[PDB]
Design a protein around this ligand. Sequence first.
Ligand SMILES: [Cu+2]
Lengths: 130, 128
Amino acid sequence: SARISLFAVVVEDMAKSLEFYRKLGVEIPAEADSAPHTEAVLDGGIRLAWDTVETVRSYDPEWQAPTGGHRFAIAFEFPDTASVDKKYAELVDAGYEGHLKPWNAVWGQRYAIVKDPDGNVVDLFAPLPL
Amino acid sequence: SARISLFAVVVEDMAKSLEFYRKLGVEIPAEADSAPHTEAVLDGGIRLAWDTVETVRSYDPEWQAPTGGHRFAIAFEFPDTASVDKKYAELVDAGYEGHLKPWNAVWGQRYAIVKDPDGNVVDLFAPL
Ligand SMILES: [Cu+2]
């Protein structure tokens, strides 16, 4: 059967998107900033990819950015709770959308939510000490 | 160090979504159909998660389904071009939306695009 190979996000501006993800530890060569397509190889070989809007329009010419809630989220795990709070403050200070400030989630994790430059939700979390 | 642990999708109906993904090789127990949240482990330990709209609104009350083009796409790899065509045909026959029929993409892969039950774009591909 098939295997999940890539999770790809559509970006209005490659440089601005990669800039955000680099702050989250994704390894992306500076040069990628000017590319129409970029991809980073993650654990197990699965890749996270980025494709510019103009690039997406090659097969979906009528594509237009959506408005509203997220249908997709990428969750980043941190070594401890303080790291979560620190990264959230860093991203918010950098002008990114702080959706839900750090809090002790009822499911047992220090949790926080921000949105990337294109409206995708990005969760930051760390297991709460037991 | 920050590491991507999960990729998650918001679903209106868990059972319907899992039904579609089970047809794409994702191993998911039947009991997950009744859960408010589900996780499937992929390679490298990364997990794909499904959260019902209700689950999302429990901590994100203002969430509203988006309107407009897709913000993302999940791409599934097949062993050969024939299997891509076969899967596209199968899913379309099964009532799922066929977005773009199979073709030989400029990037060197047999490619086809369908939509899952929640309108998400799902790419099917194989090296030529
Ligand atoms: Cu090559």
